[PDB]
């Protein structure tokens, strides 16, 4: 990471150009160049590169991912003095607090709202239950009632949560990670309603962010569900739109997750003090937040002074009304694995790969297996590639034994089958990031004859280590943990049942015992 320079990562749907403009005012005053980037999958990439001491100086994401970052040592504790802390709303500081420390600067409060085309639908529905009849009416006219992103569970969560879904139970000052709330009647009722819309052809299971945004901004669909960042492209489209409270389901408010967009500082940055100066004295000011907001609306900002100025905006009022119906996201380190598991459940139910009930029943153990598997497999592939064991801490006994097993068994596979593994690598001709992403097709082919056993599982992880050694060799070391993640995904997404029956990683250690 370059000293005397700031590199900032923010998601590509946010106002990164406005933020880069704030960066230019910083550079003007200081000589420090500010580079703003919007990598894909940055919320997964950031912990990967930061773990090796690289990556951006500053990372922007909703607050739900930062607990996991902090737990892994990847974030600097920030040090705002009392006067600065008083300039932002107290509940936004609460969102960026982890094990008693501030780990990020709060920027803005986000919640999803219903966005509707006033020319197609001046009186939008108050209930989800009305949408099928409305869609059938709009189809006779060449239109559709509603399109929104079905590939990210963030967007279906308001409906799942409406009748009782929840992520983790909060009781006695603590989230209880053993009490996950998607395998209950209300969550199932909400997701069933969503899958019925798809089954009856009011919705298409393949709809993603880009498709829904294009349809609404082209006036092809009467409604969408999206956050404040989306308002600016609608302005450009000259669709005449309103932003309103989400529909009710079984008479209950939709309950969107509330995110606080937050800016954390890399623990590996040599520019911590410059980062603090940029965030406190340039970004978190009326003029700094205005430049970002004019690019893509931020929502209800954390800075009291500027939020008072925008609060008259009726679109912000609707955001805050949906937010009050919803719930602030937990920030515990299990949130990443939760989202992995709920994303699979929603996509599986929507597509018919599983029933609604089976899909949500799997989610909890899927999240626990994912988290444990990802750590084991990622640690093995990294130590194989670098020659050095990771000293950071760890379900920890089992994960320690599993990794000891891999050093013996996985190393053994790579010894005995080196000639095969070398020809496989030559044949695949891995050069770049797309090459590595495409290996998920290899992994599925390992299991396509329908057989699963521990030997195939360990061989796939062993080949993953073999490929990872090669990736460091060609200066693509950052691709190692995406590889580990795709191996982990194939195993948990398609072999969850088998892993559970075989006692997971305890069974793995047992099977390969000397």
């Amino acid at each position: 990471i370059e000293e005397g320079k700031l590199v900032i990562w923010i998601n590509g749907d946010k106002g990164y150009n406005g933020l880069a403009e704030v960066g230019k005012k910083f550079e003007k005053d200081t000589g420090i160049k500010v580079t703003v980037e919007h990598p894909d999958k940055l919320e997964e990439k950031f912990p990967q590169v930061a773990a090796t001491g690289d990556g951006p100086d500053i990372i922007f994401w909703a607050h739900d991912r930062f607990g996991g970052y902090a737990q892994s040592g990847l974030l600097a504790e920030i040090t705002p003095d009392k006067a600065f802390q008083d300039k932002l709303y107290p509940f936004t500081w609460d969102a960026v607090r982890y094990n008693g420390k501030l780990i990020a600067y709060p920027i803005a409060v986000e919640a999803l709202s219903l966005i509707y085309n006033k020319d197609l639908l001046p009186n939008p529905p108050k209930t989800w239950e009305e949408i099928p009849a409305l869609d059938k009416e709009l189809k006779a006219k060449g239109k559709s009632a509603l399109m929104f992103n079905l590939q990210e569970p963030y967007f279906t969560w308001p409906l799942i949560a409406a009748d009782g879904g929840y992520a983790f139970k909060y009781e006695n000052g603590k989230y209880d990670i053993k009490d996950v709330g998607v395998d209950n009647a209300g969550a199932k009722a909400g997701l069933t309603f969503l899958v019925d819309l798809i089954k009856n052809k009011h919705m298409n299971a393949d709809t993603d962010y880009s498709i829904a945004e294009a349809a609404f901004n082209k006036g092809e669909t009467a409604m969408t569900i999206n956050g404040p960042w989306a308002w600016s492209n609608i302005d450009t489209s000259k669709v005449n739109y309103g932003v309103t409270v989400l529909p009710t389901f079984k008479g209950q408010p939709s309950k969107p997750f509330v995110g606080v967009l937050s800016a954390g500082i890399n623990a590996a940055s040599p520019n911590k003090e410059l980062a603090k100066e940029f965030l406190e004295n340039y970004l978190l000011t009326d003029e700094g937040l205005e430049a970002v907001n004019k690019d893509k609306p931020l929502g209800a900002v954390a800075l009291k002074s500027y939020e008072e100025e925008l609060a008259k905006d009726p679109r912000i009022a609707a955001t805050m009304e949906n937010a009050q119906k919803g719930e602030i996201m937990p920030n515990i380190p299990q949130m990443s694995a939760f989202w992995y598991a709920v994303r699979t459940a929603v996509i599986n139910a929507a597509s018919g790969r599983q029933t609604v009930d089976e899909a949500l029943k799997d989610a909890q153990t899927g999240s626990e297996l994912y988290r444990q598997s990802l750590e084991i497999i990622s640690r093995y592939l990294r130590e194989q590639a670098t020659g050095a064991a990771d000293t950071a801490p760890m379900s920890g006994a089992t994960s320690r034994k599993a990794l000891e097993t891999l050093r013996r068994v996985g190393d053994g596979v790579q010894r005995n089958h080196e000639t095969a593994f070398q020809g496989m690598l030559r044949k695949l001709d891995i050069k770049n990031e797309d090459d590595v992403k495409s290996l998920s097709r290899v992994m599925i082919h390992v299991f396509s004859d329908g057989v699963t056993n521990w030997g195939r599982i360990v061989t796939l992880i062993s080949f993953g280590a073999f490929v990872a050694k090669h990736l460091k060799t060609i200066n693509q070391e950052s691709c190692i943990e995406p590889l580990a993640e795709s191996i982990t995904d194939v195993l948990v997404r398609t072999k969850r049942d088998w892993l559970v029956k075989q006692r997971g990683w305890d069974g793995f250690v047992e099977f390969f015992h000397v």
Binding site: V442, H445, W454, G455
Partner: peptide, 22 residues
């Protein structure tokens, strides 16, 4: 079966050898 299919199938054969061994 194609190139990625061939690799994947050889990984399965190797895995079955390992499975039998252990």
């Amino acid at each position: 079966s194609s190139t990625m299919g061939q690799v994947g199938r050889q990984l399965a054969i190797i895995g079955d050898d390992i499975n039998r061994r252990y």
